[PDB]
Symmetry: D2
């Protein structure tokens, strides 16, 4: 698995609240030098990301990181991001809604954002480490099926901000089996080495969210 | 030094975890009425069931990252107020402030001010990030911008940023910057009575607490 | 009915695109002199009405806005102090038979205004002219299903016209005693007013209220 | 004097009735392609089905009244563009223009501009109202506000205001004020091929029509 090949799986990411336009400009330069698939930035940073290169593939987050926004608000955010040049959107579910068993609500929340972006690649962050710690494997699968039923293109493990943690190979395996190659699976959160990255791919991930991409690639 | 009832009267009793359910919020409301606190603070989608649960309600906007365009923060804040929130605690774009874009921070806060009508508007400045990454003057500038944009409070912290939560130095700087014309809400990591009293003595006029019972027993 | 009793049914209304803050202030002054129930103004004028009981409109007059936008608009008005919101349905949605869509559109606004009085403009003159009585009734029931407090006849801007006695009578028969019924559009005389109240209206939307009251 | 295909290329083929259905919109799109128009113009909730109809889509914002706070207009514009609209035709608050609050009109336009990114933004000044209720200089000031706020076009009318729609005089004034830096769209009550060509001769670079076929047949 080559350095260029692993890099083609990667969304090179900066989501810190303190991030400046200059930070986002350096992120895009580093992404181009590394040969990654996209940059992932916070919604108001999309103009800066688009302006920092030619033909930059930009993903933005929506309803992030808490998931605790009403659906209209997540949709509005996603639509402004697409209007500013975002090709993809990584939204967060209402994690508390999943845990209460309101799967209809989770599915409708994702369908609202789906209807607003239209053209864009939509990834749904299920916060798998939170679902697996506070409920069970079954709950994770149900959330994945809601994402599929609502028209999502990816299910995605983690925000990288929840204290329960990030991607596990078990979560990815569970998520990959549930969507069965019909949707992509993005592993994210705490992927810090080459070995972490390869193990997520081996478990079924078809995309990786990384902030320390160079160090991951250097490990090869 | 204040009694239990007096300390409680300073408090916004808070649950903002991503995993919070309606049942968690209903238990939070019941516990706030027992403790005699000033308000509950809940996430925007939980406002209707907090309000209906029979307590003054605050909500958050652009929370916790602050990385949302103004129009998204304003839309969120309008919905929460229309659903019955009495107060909104919004987060600034911390990066905008670090880059020196103080007119943009102010316009961001003005958009929210215009959406909430007469509701109490608190601006979370993420003081521990501003003091870690810039300097005292930058914290003062952000506060003044909040007052210029029509805020009613300046507020230290989200409780979610790794730079930490409320500090005495941050609270005192903020209280001087607003000169008693706005409130100062100290929040994030306030776990004991001594923490609480240290912030009120530094000039806080409201406290954001998640573990209020343990502070009150104090 | 006395002058005072008839006024008590009225939402005293200015919705013209050219309306200024000064026009809105004269409308409120006139409202309070006439003893009306409420003033009805356009969403950006709500702050000036409140600072001078206020109803505002939402998704008005076309009804052609996505649900989230109507809900955003309604919430902003309530936040600036509107006690009531009068929204417009996607009339074309109702005519295509998409009553689930119309209901969902109304429930979105319902969930965004909290405790506000929510009135749903069904554009009854268009529904009767382009569909049928049964469609008008189905739209009213969707409004009830979605949690609305009132059904209302007309924007006063649709070419098909305004309130008719039959539309109001149908709407009152269908949801009367459970939802209020507001007759609006083309109510120009005392006799028009009284004919809508007799048909089952419990609120009236008027622009020329003084003239209507004078005819008693 | 333009050929049929040339006149058609100036046209936004439009359906904005409250009663319009998805089926009405799909017929509109089919007719648009047949006629060779520049674009179809539809109401915001109709954009996704107009885009999916698979042959350029414009939508409107804060239409037709202009009486919506800026944030609502901007929200509405964003959604339409995210659903594939290439252009947005917004409506100013006409009463704000009349009250002399041109800074507020400018800010209202700037709000929509920052929501749409790169889309073509047209600003509807409701010229027939500005001329009937104010004066010519007010029309010019509103055009300047639009330019200053980053609009790509100024545009006469909604076609729903009782003071009427496009006039030769309105179009000449607007085209003078923007001086070829913005486009000028003539719209509202353009009933004949003669009406259309008089607007074009007055400086319009785009035409909003509903009865497009009957206009083109007049050539
Ligand atoms: Cl002619």
């Amino acid at each position: 698995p080559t350095r260029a090949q692993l890099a083609a799986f990667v969304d090179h990411t900066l989501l810190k609240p303190e991030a400046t336009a200059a930070d986002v400009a350096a992120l895009v330069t580093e992404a181009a030098e590394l040969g990654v698939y996209a940059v992932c930035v916070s919604p108001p940073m999309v103009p800066a990301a688009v302006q920092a290169g030619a033909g930059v593939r930009v993903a933005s987050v929506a309803g992030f990181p808490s998931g605790k926004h009403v659906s209209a608000v997540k949709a509005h955010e996603a639509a402004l991001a697409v209007a500013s040049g975002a090709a993809e959107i990584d939204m967060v579910i209402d994690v508390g809604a999943a845990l209460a068993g309101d799967l209809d609500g989770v599915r409708a929340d994702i369908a609202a954002v789906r209807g607003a972006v239209g053209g864009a690649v939509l990834k749904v962050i299920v916060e798998s480490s939170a679902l697996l710690a506070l409920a069970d494997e079954h709950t994770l699968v149900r959330v994945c099926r809601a994402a599929e039923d609502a028209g999502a293109d990816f299910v995605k493990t983690s925000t990288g901000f929840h204290p329960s943690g990030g991607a596990s190979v078990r979560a990815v395996a569970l998520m990959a089996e549930a969507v069965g190659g019909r949707l992509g699976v993005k592993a994210s959160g705490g992927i810090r080495t080459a070995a972490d990255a390869l193990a997520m791919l081996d478990a079924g991930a078809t995309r990786l969210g990384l902030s320390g991409t160079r160090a991951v690639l250097d490990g090869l």
